[PDB]
Motif scaffolding. Structure first.
Motif, PDB file in Angstrom:
ATOM      1  N   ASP A 204     -13.228   0.672   7.156  1.00  0.00           N
ATOM      2  CA  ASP A 204     -13.414  -0.694   6.273  1.00  0.00           C
ATOM      3  C   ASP A 204     -12.379  -1.916   4.820  1.00  0.00           C
ATOM      4  N   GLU A 205     -12.200  -0.738   4.603  1.00  0.00           N
ATOM      5  CA  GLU A 205     -10.882  -1.109   3.690  1.00  0.00           C
ATOM      6  C   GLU A 205      -8.994  -0.803   4.315  1.00  0.00           C
TER       7      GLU A 205
ATOM      8  N   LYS B  36      -1.958  -1.415  -3.704  1.00  0.00           N
ATOM      9  CA  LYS B  36      -3.229  -0.313  -3.806  1.00  0.00           C
ATOM     10  C   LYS B  36      -2.535   1.664  -3.419  1.00  0.00           C
TER      11      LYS B  36
ATOM     12  N   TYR C 217       0.557  -1.180  -0.215  1.00  0.00           N
ATOM     13  CA  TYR C 217      -0.017   0.058  -0.108  1.00  0.00           C
ATOM     14  C   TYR C 217       0.722   1.135  -0.451  1.00  0.00           C
TER      15      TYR C 217
ATOM     16  N   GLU D  29      -8.907  -4.059   6.288  1.00  0.00           N
ATOM     17  CA  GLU D  29      -8.367  -5.860   4.943  1.00  0.00           C
ATOM     18  C   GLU D  29      -6.726  -5.535   5.180  1.00  0.00           C
TER      19      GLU D  29
ATOM     20  N   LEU E 147      -7.177   5.424   5.020  1.00  0.00           N
ATOM     21  CA  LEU E 147      -8.171   4.959   3.946  1.00  0.00           C
ATOM     22  C   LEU E 147      -9.603   4.362   4.841  1.00  0.00           C
TER      23      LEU E 147
END
Ligand SMILES: C[C@H](O)[C@@H](CCc1cccc2ccccc12)n1cnc(C(N)=O)c1
Ligand SMILES: [Zn+2]
Length: 349
Positions: free
Chosen positions: A335-336, A144, A94, A339, A332
């Motif tokens: 939710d993301e 990401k 990320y 993850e 982020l």
């Protein structure tokens, strides 16, 4: 050779300081700009620091390559795209990346940067070029990516159009605001354009990060927390000179944007002192490792993780904890975030 091969997160990289040499000469010549050299391995050598410099010296590296990319649409596109790929090569799962969209424009930007006279490329489609590049970069490379836009310290005029771009291109792919340039211009955190910018940012939910405490005092840090309401801190080395400010920032989990290779080469770190990062592993605070400028500091993340590895005693258990910390403190949505969290624990196990 890697100091840590597990995946990593990075939160503070400047796009326009992670362009590839090969690519800059490609553009300088295909546009006629052209520049101090022609073989990649020698151009990298003149743009690149190995030794601390002054602000004009430093600033000047930007002077050589930038005119080769600003203005050209597919220079913009190709640089965001090729950025993602370098970060794929780099162990990163990320990344957040920042730039100033004005600094790549040539239309609707007073003053016009890098001596270019005019085209039709505005700040608005620079974002969107960049983020197109980042999206098919993400998709082709499995990293990401999100982006931060940077206000510039010396140019408060540009700041309302930053908050505004952030709001517009929200999600797709921009998630925060920055303040960059030299934190040393007197009164700069308090310039009314910068502050109304950060205020629109809390009004509309845009994330915030400020460059503070690299070369300037604990009061630029203070300025950034109590006034600009930052959520995180680029560098922040100089909050250490104020121990109630330091202590209060530990108490509320500041996220600190550390860039240790970058900081020998700038000057922000004198080698005969504590590196601020080490006090940072000892006091167990919330911090990341970060490359800042690959192109100019002749580096990658491994240079940062190497350097900490063998000069400063860090271990793989702090290297994880710092990456997770990073993920938690990333911009982020939650939710993301959970993850990204999951993938990281799993990988570390
Ligand atoms: C934010 C951007 O991504 C640029 C800005 C480059 C630049 C342009 C014009 C004026 C400046 C004044 C001070 C410092 C950098 C400046 N940039 C790239 N790396 C840094 C850094 N190491 O802090 C800043
Ligand atoms: Zn930076």
């Amino acid at each position: 050779t890697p100091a840590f091969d597990k995946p990593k997160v990075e939160l503070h990289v400047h796009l326009d300081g992670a362009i590839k040499p090969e690519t800059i000469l490609y553009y300088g010549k295909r546009r006629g700009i052209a520049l101090p050299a022609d073989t990649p391995e020698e151009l990298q050598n003149i743009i690149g620091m190995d030794k601390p410099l002054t602000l004009p010296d430093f600033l000047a590296k930007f002077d050589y390559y930038m005119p080769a990319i600003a203005g050209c649409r597919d220079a913009i596109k190709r640089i965001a795209y090729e950025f993602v790929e370098m970060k794929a090569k780099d162990g990163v799962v990320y990344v957040e990346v920042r730039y100033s969209p004005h600094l790549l424009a040539n239309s609707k930007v007073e003053p016009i940067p890098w001596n270019q006279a005019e085209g039709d490329l505005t700040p608005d489609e620079v974002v969107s070029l960049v983020n197109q590049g980042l999206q098919e970069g993400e998709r082709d490379f499995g990293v990401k990516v999100r982006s931060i836009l940077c206000c510039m310290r010396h140019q408060p005029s540009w700041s309302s159009e930053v908050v505004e771009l952030c709001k517009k291109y929200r999600e797709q792919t921009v998630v925060a605001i920055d303040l960059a340039g030299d934190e040393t211009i007197e009164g700069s955190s308090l310039f009314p354009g910068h502050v109304q910018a950060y205020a629109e940012a809390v009004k509309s939910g845009v994330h915030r990060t400020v460059h503070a405490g690299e070369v300037g005092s604990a009061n630029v840090v203070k300025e950034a927390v109590d006034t600009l309401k930052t959520e995180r801190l680029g560098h922040g080395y100089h909050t250490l000179e104020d121990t109630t400010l330091y202590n209060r920032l530990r108490q509320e989990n500041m996220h600190f944007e550390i860039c240790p290779w970058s900081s020998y080469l700038t000057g922000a770190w004198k080698p005969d002192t504590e590196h601020a990062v080490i006090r940072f592993k000892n006091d167990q605070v919330n911090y990341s490792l970060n490359t800042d400028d690959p192109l100019i500091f002749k580096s990658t993340l491994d240079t940062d993780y190497q350097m900490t590895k063998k000069d400063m005693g860090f271990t793989e258990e702090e290297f994880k904890r710092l990456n997770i910390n990073a993920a938690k403190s990333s911009f982020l949505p939650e939710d993301e975030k959970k993850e990204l969290l999951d993938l990281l624990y799993k990988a570390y196990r």
